[PDB]
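Aim 2 progress update. The chain analyzed this quarter is reproduced below.
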Amino acid sequence: STGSATTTPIDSLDDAYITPVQIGTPAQTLNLDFDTGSSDLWVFSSETTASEVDGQTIYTPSKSTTAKLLSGATWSISYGDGSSSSGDVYTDTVSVGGLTVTGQAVESAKKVSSSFTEDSTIDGLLGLAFSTLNTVSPTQQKTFFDNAKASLDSPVFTADLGYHAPGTYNFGFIDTTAYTGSITYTAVSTKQGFWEWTSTGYAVGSGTFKSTSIDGIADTGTTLLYLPATVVSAYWAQVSGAKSSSSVGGYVFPCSATLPSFTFGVGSARIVIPGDYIDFGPISTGSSSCFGGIQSSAGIGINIFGDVALKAAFVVFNGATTPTLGFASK
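Predicted structure tokens:
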């Protein structure tokens, strides 16, 4: 089997991407944030505290003839941005772009933190990291990809995120029309439950490539590119007037600037992030200070190849017995 679904930016900055997902019988379609940095499929629901729902579409398990309470199971998750959610668990039929999994754990939110309530466009998350990170207790549950894998034509999914435009998540096949050149594959460590890999270095604009190993995660659920402070300083030093602002929470730059590109290495190959992809717009409405799309990971504990980086590439998440990642230009 295969599946193919369009993913759409939630706003004009590509802060996140939503993908329609069919849950239950008859189908209830919710727009989920596909997150290769986490491993829970959770949704706003009829069980979510009413004051914490503000415009989202909810899953109502009582209206699904295939929903079954997973007795005794609870979940609770906290994300790198400080947001969180928790609740109980159903199993139900879940389909993405024509690919169907029966018996998928659908984690129903009873509580969500303010940032989720405040984002009316995201109805939940669909985790695509390794199932060892799934938070369901006392019986850990498998991701949608893990459940579908054996049925797929090939044990892979691909992320093709757009810049200010829709893109595609494919399951079970590699669309050879969706990228240019060849796909360069690189080793993955699953020891932390992430799609963790080592970039071979970077360049800023037209500058020379610096060969240096940068361990990080391919994380579709993180907006920005978080890299070591040395690398980020070298990037922003090429932008007149850019500075790190403790009060804003990262590097800002004059909105009048033209940003240089940023290149990262994948083995001997190179992925170029155009400068425009690094502009996240005014820090507040009407400000001439703009927020940068490359930020320091120093306070995180891990480097994160988020959407800023991934949307410059066609990315293969290869879930073979030994997982690997593939990157192509597009």
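The two ends are 25 Å apart (CA to CA). The longest strand covers residues 99-112. These observations will guide the mutagenesis experiments scheduled for the next reporting period.
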